[PDB]
């Protein structure tokens, strides 16, 4: 059977405030 | 003779409870060194009325906090800012209210 | 087909209870005002839901696994704490309490209590008694410890304020309450309405 | 011979409730007039019988296997469709209903209901709950869900009619109700009267 | 407590359909006037009952073991031969027939048919199909073979006659129809109304 | 989240206590069937005020 | 869908709709999503919002 | 001794901005 027809992927990313050093 | 016992035994028991809310005073109601004292909560077991530890306190005569630790549970985001100092004074008679020099208080 | 047999029909589901409304500044002046929701957890207390529509067709019920759910409809920039607990004894009325801290403390003392900001979501579990006592499904009657298996109290700990520091006063809505329940009904019937 | 053990004493028996009376044409005017019998099924509800006399000498009871029974005193030529069900929630009162059809439907939907013509005989069972609760053997008091394990209702579906397709206007007596019961009492004592 | 499993919930019960009325002499004039009841046997066809109320809270249904039941409100002295069958193809309509004998024959040839005099009682079964298809619990819509698993027809073979060999011209009421059913619903939901 | 627990646990504890004194009624105050009831003390744990149970 | 025309019958042995948001956590609105297996069940005919929800 | 009298628990959660995908 036809595999991987319309495979979509998701990888969530956060977006904080005040990246500190 | 119906003699109640004579064993003065210690009953150690642990658990968390809830003192009160903290009310920062803002610019209007902060016009003095006393206004900067937000919480004056004695740590006597019998001081926390609604709790049940205080109720049990009445069932014994003496107590001793073998360990106590107050914990602050905030309700605001990191947008607001204000410094806070918290110290459990072991001498109740030491009253900061009598002080006027804010820096001395801090 | 004409069986005269009785048996528990344990069936699961979910339901939408109502939209909470944080009380704000104006409508919040005393303690009892801080009680946003007083909703019995009797199956037949939520009118249009599936749970109550089913309950109408039995005598009794017993939450084998119930849990109220909070889903916020606001950003994370707003600030207010919430406490929720389900008292398994209906006749315990905290409205009589004046001291707010005493109220929050008798809330937290209940085992199934929960505290959460109204910007995130959490679950309020119903704790089940240990005697197997079944509860009647119909509307509340002479006594309540027969019908109601619990009561959901929702509390406003802090005051409601916004991105800036100014506290809101318009009594807006924060989220919604859902019920992910599992109940067992015993006796097929119809209750009057 | 001075034992203090509490043990269930299951014991069988039979009894005699009362005579019923179909309401006829003139007196059948609404939905509640179609209720010929509203008779609890608590042990201590039938004084002159044996079950109540025995109940007087225990504190609690529980219908292990009960069955009401109808015996007519009329010929087959007459016809009237009755419904008889034992509601296990004594506070459920159909008299508050006005829609006849809904009354008959809430009577029929009960699992222990039977429909029959008032010229033949039947046996109305009592479906017992699951949680093993015990009931109280005394007179009715503050609440009823403590004493009454059930309530017997006897309905009149069709209008009483004679040999021909003609109704009757006499409001006559039809038969009698009996109770074939086996009950388990828990705590020996004597209740006032 | 937030499971999404779909499982059949087989549950028993009883209900009350309606009262029937034999058509008599004057009104019995053709083949279709001999049809006293044309009543579907879909769950959601009897509103005030319990089966439809439960159906409202599922999407599909399937009669596991159903049985219609006749209870008369008339004496034995009267006589009228009835036929009752549950056609599993709701679109099959006998009203289009004119030959009385063919109507009675297509009523009798059905496997779940019974013939009886309107003074006694019977139990009309519903013969279920084989392919395991499920039906829909909603009101009637574009098609019927999706919702209605059956259709109950009640016929009048012989003319209503009294004690003697004489007919009657009143078109009186005879009895009532009950349903002793056990049904399996598949998908929890709520259907509009 | 600060979630209080969800364990409905049983706590069994034992001990003796003190209900009240019994006052026999004598010949004067015993003039009825009610006068012969000297003690009506409910056994609800919350009925013994001074006690700690 | 185009392939669908190359066969006669179909059956979703598994389907799952996924929501891919485009907003930050500043905005707020509750959403309900349910795949009704009976197409003829039309919510539009409803007026009571609470009944719909 | 009576254990677990009034045990409370805390589990902090962050709340960033612009969860990205
Ligand atoms: Ca000091
Ligand atoms: Ca309580
Ligand atoms: Ca019990
Ligand atoms: Ca009821
Ligand atoms: Ca009832
Ligand atoms: Ca008693
Ligand atoms: Ca056919
Ligand atoms: Ca539908
Ligand atoms: Ca649907």
């Amino acid at each position: 059977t036809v595999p991987n027809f319309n495979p979509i992927v998701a990888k969530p990313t956060v977006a904080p405030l005040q990246t500190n050093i | 003779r119906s003699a109640r016992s004579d064993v003065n035994a210690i009953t150690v028991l642990n658990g968390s409870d809830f003192l009160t809310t903290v009310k920062v005073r803002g610019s209007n109601n902060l016009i003095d060194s006393k206004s900067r004292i937000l919480v004056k909560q004695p740590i006597s077991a019998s001081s926390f009325l609604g709790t049940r530890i205080s109720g049990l306190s009445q069932f014994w005569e003496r107590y001793r906090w073998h360990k106590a630790a107050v914990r602050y549970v905030p309700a605001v985001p990191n947008t607001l800012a204000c410094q806070l100092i918290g110290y459990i004074d072991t001498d109740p008679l030491d009253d900061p209210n009598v002080i006027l020099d804010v820096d001395q208080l801090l | 087909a004409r069986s005269d047999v009785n048996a528990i029909t344990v069936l699961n589901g979910s339901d939408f209870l109502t939209t909470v409304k944080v009380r704000g500044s104006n409508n919040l002046i005393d303690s009892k005002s801080r009680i946003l929701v007083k909703q019995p957890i009797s199956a037949s207390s939520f009118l249009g839901t599936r749970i109550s529509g089913l309950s109408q067709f039995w005598e009794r019920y017993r939450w084998h696994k119930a849990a109220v759910r909070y889903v916020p409809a606001v950003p994370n920039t707003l600030a207010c704490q919430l406490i929720g607990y389900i008292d398994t004894d209906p006749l315990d009325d905290p409205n009589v309490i004046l001291d707010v801290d005493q109220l929050l403390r008798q809330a937290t003392s209940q085992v199934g209590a929960r505290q959460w900001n109204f910007s995130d979501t959490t679950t309020i579990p119903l704790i089940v008694r240990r005697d197997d006592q079944l509860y009647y499904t119909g509307q509340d009657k002479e006594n309540v410890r027969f019908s109601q298996q619990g009561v959901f109290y929702l509390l406003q700990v802090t005051t409601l304020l916004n991105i800036s520091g100014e506290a809101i006063t318009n009594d807006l809505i924060s989220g919604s309450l859902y019920l992910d329940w599992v109940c067992g009904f015993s006796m097929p019937q119809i209750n009057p309405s």
Side-chain angles (χ1 to χ4, degrees), chain A, chain B, chain C:
Chain A
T1 190
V2 60
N4 305 325
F5 196 68
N6 292 130
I8 288 185
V9 178
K11 287 173 70 155
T13 315
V14 286
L17 74 164
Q18 191 59 293
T19 290
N20 274 327
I21 311 286
Chain B
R1 296 285 188 70
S2 196
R4 174 72 206 281
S5 57
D6 61 358
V7 170
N8 174 8
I10 295 163
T11 75
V12 60
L13 49 85
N14 76 336
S16 299
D17 282 315
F18 177 102
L19 274 64
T20 179
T21 71
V22 307
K23 164 181 277 181
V24 301
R25 210 67 71 103
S27 282
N28 309 142
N29 295 291
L30 186 156
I31 56 171
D32 193 5
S33 158
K34 299 180 205 291
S35 68
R36 305 165 76 84
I37 295 148
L38 325 179
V39 187
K40 187 164 171 180
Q41 195 50 52
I43 308 294
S44 195
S46 310
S47 296
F48 317 125
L49 174 55
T51 52
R52 54 176 184 159
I53 186 69
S54 75
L56 287 194
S57 84
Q58 313 299 301
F59 301 169
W60 288 268
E61 182 52 272
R62 283 169 201 101
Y63 81 83
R64 180 182 176 71
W65 300 111
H66 283 280
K67 164 184 165 304
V70 179
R71 204 162 32 69
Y72 183 78
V73 184
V76 306
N78 290 6
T79 66
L80 312 191
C82 198
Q83 277 272 115
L84 292 174
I85 303 171
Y87 64 105
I88 301 176
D89 197 8
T90 60
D91 182 7
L93 266 64
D94 279 348
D95 193 8
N97 294 288
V98 306
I99 290 161
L100 283 80
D101 206 28
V102 63
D103 63 71
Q104 176 52 31
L105 187 149
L106 304 163
Chain C
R2 203 188 186 195
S3 197
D4 45 8
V5 74
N6 166 16
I8 65 172
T9 62
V10 60
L11 57 88
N12 51 32
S14 195
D15 284 319
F16 166 88
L17 272 42
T18 176
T19 60
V20 300
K21 187 191 287 196
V22 294
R23 201 68 71 101
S25 158
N26 303 136
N27 293 314
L28 198 169
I29 70 186
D30 69 356
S31 159
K32 71 193 305 316
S33 65
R34 306 167 88 80
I35 296 167
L36 317 170
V37 181
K38 192 264 183 195
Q39 198 64 68
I41 299 288
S42 60
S44 67
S45 281
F46 326 110
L47 189 79
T49 55
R50 177 169 159 266
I51 181 63
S52 82
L54 296 179
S55 75
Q56 191 193 327
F57 306 125
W58 281 274
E59 274 290 6
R60 301 188 193 87
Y61 72 84
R62 183 189 163 69
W63 307 108
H64 292 274
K65 207 185 312 295
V68 173
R69 199 153 62 80
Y70 187 83
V71 176
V74 290
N76 302 73
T77 195
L78 291 148
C80 205
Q81 290 269 113
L82 289 178
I83 294 183
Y85 69 110
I86 296 173
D87 202 357
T88 53
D89 180 15
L91 269 76
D92 282 13
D93 212 8
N95 292 293
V96 64
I97 297 166
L98 283 63
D99 190 18
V100 59
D101 310 327
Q102 178 57 38
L103 205 159
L104 309 172
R105 283 184 283 234
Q106 64 84 30
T108 287
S109 287
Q110 173 68 230
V111 56
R114 243 79 162 167
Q115 174 172 184
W116 73 97
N117 271 276
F118 76 102
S119 73
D120 71 356
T121 176
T122 189
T123 301
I124 321 292
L126 176 64
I127 314 300
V128 297
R129 55 194 295 173
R130 308 181 64 92
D131 49 335
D132 89 359
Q133 200 262 346
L134 297 154
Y135 297 79
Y136 292 94
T137 41
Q139 72 289 31
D140 303 340
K141 299 204 166 105
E142 293 292 328
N143 190 309
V144 182
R145 284 142 156 178
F146 283 122
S147 305
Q148 298 181 19
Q149 175 154 7
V151 193
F152 176 74
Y153 299 95
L154 190 77
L155 281 69
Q156 207 175 327
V157 173
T158 63
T159 197
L160 170 72
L161 71 166
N162 56 355
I163 298 167
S164 311
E166 41 264 30
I168 297 173
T169 83
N170 315 138
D171 204 4
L172 61 84
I173 286 172
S174 63
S176 55
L177 296 160
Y178 303 90
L179 179 60
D180 318 289
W181 50 263
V182 179
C183 49
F185 305 95
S186 160
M187 188 71 68
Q189 79 162 3
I190 280 177
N191 280 314
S193 199

